[PDB]
Design a protein around this motif. Structure first.
Motif, short mmCIF file in Angstrom:
data_model
loop_
_atom_site.label_atom_id
_atom_site.label_comp_id
_atom_site.label_asym_id
_atom_site.label_seq_id
_atom_site.Cartn_x
_atom_site.Cartn_y
_atom_site.Cartn_z
N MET A 197 0.85 -1.23 0.00
CA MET A 197 0.00 0.00 0.00
C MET A 197 0.87 1.26 0.00
O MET A 197 0.96 1.93 -1.03
N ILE A 198 1.56 1.58 1.11
CA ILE A 198 2.48 2.73 1.23
C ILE A 198 3.96 2.30 1.26
O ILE A 198 4.28 1.16 1.61
N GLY A 199 4.86 3.23 0.95
CA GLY A 199 6.27 3.16 1.33
C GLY A 199 6.53 3.75 2.73
O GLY A 199 5.62 4.24 3.39
N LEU A 200 7.80 3.78 3.14
CA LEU A 200 8.26 4.38 4.41
C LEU A 200 9.44 5.32 4.15
O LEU A 200 10.41 4.94 3.49
N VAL A 201 9.40 6.54 4.69
CA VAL A 201 10.42 7.56 4.36
C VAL A 201 11.65 7.37 5.25
O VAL A 201 11.52 7.08 6.45
N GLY A 202 12.84 7.59 4.69
CA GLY A 202 14.09 7.58 5.42
C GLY A 202 15.18 8.51 4.87
O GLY A 202 14.96 9.34 3.99
N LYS A 203 16.39 8.32 5.40
CA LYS A 203 17.61 9.08 5.12
C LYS A 203 18.83 8.17 5.24
O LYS A 203 18.92 7.39 6.19
N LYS A 204 19.79 8.28 4.33
CA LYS A 204 21.10 7.63 4.43
C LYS A 204 21.95 8.32 5.50
O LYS A 204 22.24 9.51 5.36
N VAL A 205 22.34 7.61 6.55
CA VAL A 205 23.03 8.18 7.73
C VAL A 205 24.43 7.62 7.97
O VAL A 205 25.17 8.13 8.81
N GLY A 206 24.83 6.59 7.22
CA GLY A 206 26.20 6.06 7.21
C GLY A 206 26.34 4.80 6.37
O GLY A 206 25.36 4.11 6.10
N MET A 207 27.57 4.44 6.00
CA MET A 207 27.90 3.20 5.29
C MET A 207 29.09 2.53 5.99
O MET A 207 29.96 3.20 6.54
N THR A 208 29.07 1.19 6.04
CA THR A 208 30.06 0.40 6.76
C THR A 208 30.16 -1.03 6.20
O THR A 208 29.51 -1.39 5.21
N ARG A 209 30.99 -1.87 6.82
CA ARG A 209 31.24 -3.27 6.48
C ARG A 209 31.45 -4.06 7.77
O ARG A 209 32.30 -3.70 8.59
N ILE A 210 30.62 -5.08 7.98
CA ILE A 210 30.44 -5.81 9.25
C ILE A 210 30.63 -7.31 9.04
O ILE A 210 30.76 -7.77 7.91
N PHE A 211 30.72 -8.09 10.12
CA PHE A 211 30.89 -9.54 10.06
C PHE A 211 29.58 -10.33 9.99
O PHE A 211 28.61 -10.00 10.69
N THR A 212 29.57 -11.41 9.22
CA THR A 212 28.50 -12.43 9.21
C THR A 212 28.56 -13.32 10.45
O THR A 212 29.50 -13.25 11.25
N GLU A 213 27.58 -14.22 10.63
CA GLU A 213 27.60 -15.24 11.70
C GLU A 213 28.80 -16.21 11.57
O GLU A 213 29.29 -16.73 12.58
N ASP A 214 29.32 -16.40 10.35
CA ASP A 214 30.53 -17.19 10.05
C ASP A 214 31.82 -16.34 9.95
O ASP A 214 32.89 -16.86 9.63
N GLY A 215 31.74 -15.05 10.28
CA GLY A 215 32.87 -14.14 10.52
C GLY A 215 33.47 -13.42 9.31
O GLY A 215 34.21 -12.45 9.50
N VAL A 216 33.15 -13.83 8.07
CA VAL A 216 33.55 -13.09 6.86
C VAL A 216 32.83 -11.74 6.76
O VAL A 216 31.84 -11.49 7.45
N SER A 217 33.36 -10.81 5.96
CA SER A 217 32.79 -9.46 5.85
C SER A 217 31.61 -9.35 4.87
O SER A 217 31.59 -9.98 3.81
N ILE A 218 30.65 -8.47 5.19
CA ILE A 218 29.49 -8.07 4.37
C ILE A 218 29.31 -6.54 4.43
O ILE A 218 29.30 -5.97 5.53
N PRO A 219 29.23 -5.82 3.29
CA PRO A 219 28.99 -4.38 3.25
C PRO A 219 27.52 -4.03 3.51
O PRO A 219 26.62 -4.73 3.04
N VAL A 220 27.28 -2.94 4.23
CA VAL A 220 25.94 -2.47 4.61
C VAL A 220 25.82 -0.94 4.61
O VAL A 220 26.77 -0.23 4.95
N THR A 221 24.64 -0.42 4.27
CA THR A 221 24.29 0.99 4.46
C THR A 221 23.26 1.12 5.58
O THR A 221 22.27 0.39 5.63
N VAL A 222 23.51 2.07 6.49
CA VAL A 222 22.64 2.45 7.60
C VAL A 222 21.65 3.51 7.12
O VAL A 222 22.04 4.59 6.65
N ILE A 223 20.37 3.21 7.26
CA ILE A 223 19.25 4.09 6.95
C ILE A 223 18.54 4.47 8.26
O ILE A 223 18.11 3.61 9.02
N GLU A 224 18.33 5.77 8.46
CA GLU A 224 17.36 6.27 9.43
C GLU A 224 15.98 6.27 8.77
O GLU A 224 15.81 6.92 7.74
N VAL A 225 14.99 5.63 9.37
CA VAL A 225 13.58 5.69 8.94
C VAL A 225 12.75 6.34 10.04
O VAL A 225 12.98 6.11 11.22
N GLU A 226 11.80 7.20 9.65
CA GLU A 226 11.06 8.06 10.58
C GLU A 226 9.59 7.63 10.73
O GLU A 226 8.97 7.13 9.79
#
Lengths: 127, 123, 209, 114, 56
Positions: free
Chosen positions: C1-30
RNA sequence: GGACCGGAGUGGACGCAUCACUGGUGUUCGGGUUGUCAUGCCAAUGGCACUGCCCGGUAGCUAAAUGCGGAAGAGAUAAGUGCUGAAAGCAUCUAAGCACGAAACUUGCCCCGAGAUGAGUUCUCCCUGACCCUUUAAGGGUCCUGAAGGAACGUUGAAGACGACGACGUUGAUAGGCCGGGUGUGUAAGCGCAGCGAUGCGUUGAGCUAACCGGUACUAAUGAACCGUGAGGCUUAACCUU
RNA sequence: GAUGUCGGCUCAUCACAUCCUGGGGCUGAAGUAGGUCCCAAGGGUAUGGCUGUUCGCCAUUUAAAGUGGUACGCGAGCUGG
RNA sequence: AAUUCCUUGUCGGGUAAGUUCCGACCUGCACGAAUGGCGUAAUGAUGGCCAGGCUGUCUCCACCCGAGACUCAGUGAAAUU
RNA sequence: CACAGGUGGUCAGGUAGAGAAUACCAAGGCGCUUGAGAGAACUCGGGUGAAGGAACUAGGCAAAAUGGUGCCGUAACUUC
């Protein structure tokens, strides 16, 4: 363009930018009031105030470091002994800019820049 | 690696000094290659008394690169040059009986793994 | 039906449950509010009009402020609207912060990209470079030829050439949802998102072919 | 968690070993031996310092059966297990990537003890 | 390149339609002196932001 | 030697987004280093020789990096496959009837779009004027009196050639500075000790610092003035028992 | 009272008597092909040797390495062999 | 062959592949000894080919900087029509 | 043309160097009469370009690279 890369191009290389603002800074600690173009006044506040902030901290190493702005032997004795200590109660803002519009009939934007705590005498007409 | 028609060092006992690539294998309208690719290769600087001979044409895989290998965790394994393992042109598998220097996870793939039975470094 | 509004607030690279790296973007949603819901005379079906942000409201006009007063004195920042069908969304504040996209596996994020000054030009069009030797005249990145002949006697309509960027809306589709946290505005998505830190976006369910 | 700092501080290590450039180190690292995890070790000199937040990484350089080898290691990742200092050499610069070409103080060193 | 036919005075007039002088949307007025000026600038009487300034 | 629809994993060619990662670049950061000048000299620091040269590099930009998209499903239809069936007492995919059917088409995916003058639709906000002359769905003059909003200006921006676009201007953290943090660089100067001295050692994991980031009214963002107002032409229909 | 080059580079765009990709008929169609053939224009489409070079001959890769139109497609865009 | 027609002749060598190059070949394209024949060292702002160093020429186009581009005031033309 | 041009003869300094080469620099001279902004793609010139290494192009042209002194060492071939 040039987003999040703050600066002023306008003319020749950083060596000329240094030699010009060294001379204009020396003139500002000499006269304590200066008339200059607005984009030069708006850049001078970014290099002359850190010199005054260094001048709040007296040492042989810091007074040899001030030679990177002014080579004059009396200005290095006005710094650290008056300039610096005279602002020690303030949270920066040792200078202020006053915008005077264009040169008459022309484009060039003109301003005054002065020291904030100086003895007052500019409380009269501009013309 | 990024360029085609290029010299590579040997990593196995079949020959000596350098050998030259002529194409990357798999994909089409292609030019980029890495350690997971098979290449077609020619004998240039090896001695004729070895397992190889002058102007002969083989397949190979790359095993060391100066750009390095990054994908195992997200940080680089790097090497001091570019080197390869020599394979049969018709049926693949290595023609060498002994490998020297370190290897890769891609060197443990079914078409290449027969020379790494001695379990070398970074396998 | 609707979307949800947000903002890009940072980008980073974090570990999986098996410890290898995965890239991610942090979104603030209001948190979602509804200003009215519209009658069948608008859109062709119902429509739903929504707000999420708020601000100090010094620069907000009375045409906008009377509407935010009608919507519960929300002092709102931005205003968006969508088609409504089948669902029974409320006519007032819903307070949904992340929960619309907490269980949805992928999202079709519509970003706003970043400003680049000139990026309607040259680099936009991947034109092959021009030589500094081999005799070559007055060229380094330019397209060279731009059309056909005297017979058509025109450049073709819609053809690649110079222009400002000035920023534009873009949707890459089907980014994987890695993490969410309600009332703390968190949406974490795999890889890159359009725009810089501070760039606005809207989140959508996965709707690709 | 807070969307700023705390979101990434919860993935950092709180007991990272105190190595720096010009240390000869042994680095323990998981090699994923097919369908099961197994630990391996790498030994060489540190040619880059590690300080860049959750992304902090260091670079170690050695030789392997006549071939020149380098490895970058991620500090906070679970695949990097532990680091032990073998020797401490004085190398001055924060990163020594020119040591891939220059032999000056590469295999000969003065003890740093820092 | 050069022209193949000289235009009329309508062309020079239509190129010039978008240019004007002194489009300041009126002057500012200085409550401290009664002088007129351009906004956020010093008056000829030196008055600005409640005091006299920039004299030598 | 050797199967298709469907399902799963993955490579190449192509496009897109970003600067987190791995690299590049980084004349406004830190250090190393050659010739030479300056500061009375030493010490040290500053000018100049391509940014003198060499290396690391924040911010920003960016692939050789990383992530993402490449057509499902539905509708209609060509070749064609197919049922019922005639002119031709029968037959036949075609004539009437009628099922199935492609990457093209419509829908579904991405972006622009109401100047779409044939200007859709909803919502919020604001203003209640008049005298005189005449030409009167009218024009002119003059006076009383201004709202929503717009404009201008400042502080200026991950918006930018100019315009346009965004935030903030005490409804102040908008910019500079400051304070603090942080990334980066790599243990300074002065002194003291050691040495004949180059030079070392200790204080010292030092000193220095940019564009990032939190706080901060020290510095800089004025009274205004201007444009825009006076409840908005004509007619028919419906409804308000006007 | 101006005709300044082909082959090439950059940038391309259009056609079918369709290169490949979708569907379909026939076969001397067992499967796998190969030959043949109808409908079909949304997208996709090589690399290297010798030559001024398209073409040619030659090697390699691949899905295939293909045909035609456009002041001989394009210098008030690039080469001047 | 600055000569050779046909021709990218025929064979060797370098190369994955060499219309070029270099060596060898021709019952000799219209070769031939002062408009000189053959041949050697050193020399050449010398024609063609090849190996190594090294390189953004390139696969493929990325960042930084000076000057011009752009804004405004003053002065303000031209080839051309 | 107050033109980024041309014009016989002459003299010389510190650090440095073989030097009238060459960098800094003294004496002495020049500050190149549109003025002030902007910080654009692009274009010319200039610095850096990961990996490959002439695959580019008619052609490594151009550019980068090489680049000195002393001593050791030094081939084909040659008219020695």
């Amino acid at each position: 363009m040039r987003h999040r890369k703050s600066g002023r191009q306008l003319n020749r290389n950083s060596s000329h930018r240094q030699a010009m603002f060294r001379n204009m800074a020396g003139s500002l600690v000499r006269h304590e009031i200066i008339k200059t173009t607005l984009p030069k006044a708006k850049e001078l506040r970014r290099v002359v105030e850190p010199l005054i902030t260094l001048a709040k901290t007296d040492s042989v190493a810091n007074r040899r470091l001030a030679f990177a702005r002014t080579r004059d032997n009396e200005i290095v004795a006005k710094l650290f002994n008056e300039l610096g200590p005279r602002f020690a109660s303030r949270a920066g803002g040792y200078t202020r800019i006053l915008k005077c519009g264009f040169r008459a009939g022309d484009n060039a934007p003109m301003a005054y820049i002065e020291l904030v705590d100086r003895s007052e005498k500019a409380e009269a007409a501009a013309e | 690696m990024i360029q085609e028609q290029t010299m590579l060092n040997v990593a196995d006992n079949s020959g000596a000094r350098r050998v030259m690539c002529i194409k990357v294998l798999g994909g089409s309208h292609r030019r980029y290659a890495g350690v997971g690719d098979i290449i077609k290769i020619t004998i240039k600087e090896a001695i004729p008394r070895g397992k190889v001979k002058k102007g002969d044409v083989l397949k190979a895989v790359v095993v060391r690169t100066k750009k390095g290998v990054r994908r195992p965790d997200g940080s680089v394994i790097r090497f001091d040059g570019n080197a390869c393992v020599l394979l049969n042109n018709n049926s693949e598998q290595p023609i060498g009986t002994r490998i020297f220097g370190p290897v890769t996870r891609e060197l443990r793939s079914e078409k290449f793994m027969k020379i790494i039975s001695l379990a070398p470094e970074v396998l | 039906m609707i979307g949800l509004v947000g903002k890009k607030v940072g980008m980073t690279r974090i570990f999986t449950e098996d410890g290898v790296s995965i890239p991610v973007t942090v979104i603030e949603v209001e948190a979602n509010r509804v200003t009215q819901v519209k009658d069948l005379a608008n859109d062709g079906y119902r429509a739903i009009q929504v707000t999420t942000g708020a601000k100090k409201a010094n620069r907000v006009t009375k045409p906008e402020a009377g509407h935010f007063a009608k919507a519960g004195v929300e002092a709102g920042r931005g205003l968006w609207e969508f088609r409504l069908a089948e669902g029974e969304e409320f006519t007032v504040g819903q307070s949904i912060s992340v929960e619309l996209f907490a269980d949805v596996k992928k999202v079709d994020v519509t970003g706003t990209s970043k400003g680049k000054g000139f990026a309607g030009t040259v680099k936009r069009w991947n034109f092959r470079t021009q030589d500094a030797t081999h005799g070559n005249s007055l060229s380094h990145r330019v397209p060279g030829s731009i059309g056909q002949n005297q017979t058509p006697g025109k450049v073709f309509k819609g053809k690649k050439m110079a222009g400002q960027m000035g920023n534009e809306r873009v949707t890459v589709q089907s980014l994987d949802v890695v993490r969410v946290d309600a009332e703390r505005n968190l949406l974490l998505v795999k890889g890159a998102v359009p725009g810089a830190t501070g760039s606005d976006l809207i989140v959508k369910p996965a709707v690709k072919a | 968690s807070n969307i700023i700092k705390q979101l990434e501080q919860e993935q950092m290590k709180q007991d990272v070993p105190s190595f720096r450039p010009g240390d000869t180190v042994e680095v323990k690292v998981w090699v994923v031996e097919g369908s099961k995890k197994r630990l391996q070790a790498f030994e060489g000199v540190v040619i880059a310092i590690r300080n860049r937040g959750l992304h902090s990484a260091f670079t170690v350089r050695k030789i392997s059966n006549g071939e020149g080898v380098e490895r970058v290691f991620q500090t906070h990742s679970p695949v990097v297990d532990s680091i032990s200092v073998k020797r401490r050499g004085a190398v001055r610069k924060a990163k020594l990537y020119y040591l891939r070409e220059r032999t000056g103080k590469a295999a000969r060193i003065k003890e740093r003890l820092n | 390149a050069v022209q193949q036919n000289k235009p009329t005075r309508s062309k020079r007039g239509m190129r010039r339609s978008h240019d004007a002088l002194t489009a300041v949307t009126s002057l500012s007025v200085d409550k401290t002196s009664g002088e007129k000026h351009l906004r956020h600038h010093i008056t000829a009487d030196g008055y600005y932001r409640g005091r006299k300034v920039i004299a030598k």
